[PDB]
Amino acid sequence: AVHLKMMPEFQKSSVRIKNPTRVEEIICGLIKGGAAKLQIITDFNMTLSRFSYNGKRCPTCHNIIDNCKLVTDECRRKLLQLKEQYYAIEVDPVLTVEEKFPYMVEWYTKSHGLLIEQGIPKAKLKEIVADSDVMLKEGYENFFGKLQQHGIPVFIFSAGIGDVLEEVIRQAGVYHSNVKVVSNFMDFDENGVLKGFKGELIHVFNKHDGALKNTDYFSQLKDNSNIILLGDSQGDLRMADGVANVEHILKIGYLNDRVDELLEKYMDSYDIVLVKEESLEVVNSILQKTL
Numbered sequence: 001a002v003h004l005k006m007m008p009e010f011q012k013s014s015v016r017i018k019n020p021t022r023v024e025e026i027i028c029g030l031i032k033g034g035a036a037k038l039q040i041i042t043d044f045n046m047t048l049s050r051f052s053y054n055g056k057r058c059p060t061c062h063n064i065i066d067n068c069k070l071v072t073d074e075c076r077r078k079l080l081q082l083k084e085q086y087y088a089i090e091v092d093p094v095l096t097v098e099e100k101f102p103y104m105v106e107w108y109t110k111s112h113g114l115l116i117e118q119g120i121p122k123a124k125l126k127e128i129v130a131d132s133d134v135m136l137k138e139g140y141e142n143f144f145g146k147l148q149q150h151g152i153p154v155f156i157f158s159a160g161i162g163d164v165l166e167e168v169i170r171q172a173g174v175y176h177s178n179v180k181v182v183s184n185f186m187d188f189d190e191n192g193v194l195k196g197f198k199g200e201l202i203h204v205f206n207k208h209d210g211a212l213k214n215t216d217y218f219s220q221l222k223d224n225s226n227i228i229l230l231g232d233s234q235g236d237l238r239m240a241d242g243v244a245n246v247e248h249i250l251k252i253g254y255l256n257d258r259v260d261e262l263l264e265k266y267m268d269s270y271d272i273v274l275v276k277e278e279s280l281e282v283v284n285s286i287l288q289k290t291l
């Protein structure tokens, strides 16, 4: 039997669980199924990466570009002001997902617009990432390492910038063959200069869409009917909507901001809520018991 009270990682003060007996049953199911049944579906920004470190906010994939040498100070100022305006709406506890939706579309339209104006060169992405302040969560090496050791499919489903996310994980040495990335990927002109983005926009509140547009992937993983889903947003709860067969699914949510206002809604919607938590210790502990 799984007993959360016997697991110290689950007693940390950042760990909030509305229904601990259900979480026990789920984890029991994951352990029963083992490697052969497991797959991971995860957000990227503020889920695999840190929201803050030493009381300083850490960059998202977009911010990595916002803050880099290839963007003028005037442009950075505009982008920073856009983030102040639109992040405030993103996390606003009063607004419904449906009311936030159009503002997210608008943010990305404005943000990508400006990045295209700045003409970001493909050849500079390696340096841009290496020079940035991006930080993955504590325990990332063991998370990706254990998953690759056991050939567990990992689907990273991000509303950020795919090229940047890939370069982050490549540089951290964790972009193993079991990792599939779906995000907004840059489109480059003949000179290697940013001219637009590929495919349909993925934003905070339409991941339910892209979840259904990856059937090649999920239909090949029909046997992988036990899922661990990691997210930081209410939008992330939809990322497993394309999964072929779900037997047991555990949803772990990082709650990074507006904690008191959002705690109830997060505890109702995610099985395990990790409040202001910069490590992957809880998911790593589950994987240790499962694999």
Ligand SMILES: O=c1ccn([C@@H]2O[C@H](COP(=O)(O)O)[C@@H](O)[C@H]2O)c(=O)[nH]1
Residues within 6 Å of the ligand: 043, 044, 045, 046, 047, 060, 061, 062, 063, 083, 087, 090, 107, 108, 111, 112, 157, 158, 159, 160, 204, 233
């Ligand atoms: O111009 C933008 C657009 C989005 N985001 C952030 O990107 C995150 C989406 O990436 P992910 O969390 O889905 O990986 C959103 O939470 C949003 O705050 C930015 O920082 N700048």
Ligand SMILES: [Mg+2]
Residues within 6 Å of the ligand: 043, 044, 045, 046, 047, 231, 232, 233
């Ligand atoms: Mg996120």
Ligand code: NA
Residues within 6 Å of the ligand: 126, 167, 170, 171
């Ligand atoms: Na590299």
